[PDB]
Amino acid sequence: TCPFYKKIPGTGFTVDAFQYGVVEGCTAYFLTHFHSDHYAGLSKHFTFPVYCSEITGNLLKNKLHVQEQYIHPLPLDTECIVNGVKVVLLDANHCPGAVMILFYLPNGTVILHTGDFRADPSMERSLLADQKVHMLYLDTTYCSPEYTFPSQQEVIRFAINTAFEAVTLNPHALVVCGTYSIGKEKVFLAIADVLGSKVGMSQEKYKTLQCLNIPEINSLITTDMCSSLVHLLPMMQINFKGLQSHLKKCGGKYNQILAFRPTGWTHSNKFTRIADVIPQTKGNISIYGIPYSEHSSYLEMKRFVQWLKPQKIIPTVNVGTWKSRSTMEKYFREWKLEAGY
């Protein structure tokens, strides 16, 4: 059964609710982004209307084989009418094609559902600037002050400088980057750009990337592993055994691997600056964990919410435990008292 925090009151609508069967009274299913915990349940046999971004709709059709007649792509930043209700899709600053959804209820209530997002001050000048929001369905992934991490720009600066130094010292070094979903494409694209290479990857991952409307993509990626010195592998293979095995397959072209694991937050963030990050090394293999986040830090979340001043907040992440729920409710009240709404 579909939980209450995936239902939009006063509508026929659900958000990211595809794993519950036919939801009673749902006339349109929204999908915020193509991440498996959110799309869980979709396939070529789905026969209800799905509303989403153009990019999410390319992935639905090509990767999950959802039939074209049930995919309803909407442009961003544009007022649209869906089953009698005005909606707008906004960029969520998460993975490619990820949106927030503004719903204008027939009774005058305005609801924002963030999906998954990384809050940014640039959002304070979207179509959100122009009216009041009553209810906020909020991505609370890192809703605690211990969650700190650097900007995405600082993390990419580290990665590009680290890769360029290594390969210039040793032209026979291979760079490998881990992946298990869409998102974080800048990590491997920025490294391949500084090295003058395309990124080599499997047919299945190449297919996924070709659905993303990234400019000049045919210029940046390839399935010819032999022509590339930046390789993508599944995240599960980014360990000493997995990388040793990959190095064997390269036919003595390379004698060293430098590998990156883009994670979210890890506890080494509470002690170390990005500048000071060091790898794990074994022999000719080094592995860097880099804190490239596509979710709001605590401070970014707090700033967004204090700017928006919602009347009610409904968390969509960490909702399974009473300790988590109580923690989050405490911070929401602090924020409200400090800002005065």
Strand bridging mode 85-91 / 99-104: antiparallel
Q: Which two tokens stand for residue 255?
A: 């004698």
Shorter beta-carbon distance to Ni ion: residue 3 or 25: 3
> Using CB under 5 A as the criterion, which residues of the chain lie in contact with Ni ion when the complex forms?
35, 116
Shorter beta-carbon distance to Ni ion: residue 116 or 185: 116
Shorter beta-carbon distance to Ni ion: residue 136 or 317: 317
* Distance of closest approach, residue 222 Cβ to Ni ion, in angstroms: 27
Shorter beta-carbon distance to Ni ion: residue 116 or 228: 116
* Distance of closest approach, residue 40 Cβ to Ni ion, in angstroms: 12
The H or E element that residue 244 is part of is helix 240-249
Listed residue (180, 210, 281, 243) closest to 58, CA to CA: 210
Shorter beta-carbon distance to Ni ion: residue 228 or 293: 293
Shorter beta-carbon distance to Ni ion: residue 33 or 231: 33
Cβ-contact 265, 142 below 8 angstroms: yes
In 10 A of CB 24, how many CB atoms? Answer: 8
Whole-number Cα distances in Å, 126 to 73, 113, 151: 20, 15, 21
In 10 A of CB 165, how many CB atoms? Answer: 11
Rounded Cα distance between 199 and 302, Å, is 37
* Distance of closest approach, residue 223 Cβ to Ni ion, in angstroms: 26
* Distance of closest approach, residue 252 Cβ to Ni ion, in angstroms: 40
Shorter beta-carbon distance to Ni ion: residue 36 or 218: 36
Cβ-contact 133, 112 below 8 angstroms: yes
Rounded Cα distance between 56 and 96, Å, is 8
* Distance of closest approach, residue 27 Cβ to Ni ion, in angstroms: 25
Shorter beta-carbon distance to Ni ion: residue 116 or 300: 116
* R_g (Cα) of the chain, nearest Å: 22
* Distance of closest approach, residue 280 Cβ to Ni ion, in angstroms: 27
* Distance of closest approach, residue 316 Cβ to Ni ion, in angstroms: 11
11-19 contacts, C-beta under 8 A, 24 or more apart:
11/83, 11/85, 11/103, 11/105, 12/83, 13/82, 13/83, 13/85, 13/103, 15/101, 15/113, 15/115, 15/137, 16/115, 18/42, 18/46
Rounded Cα distance between 318 and 28, Å, is 26
* Distance of closest approach, residue 92 Cβ to Ni ion, in angstroms: 9
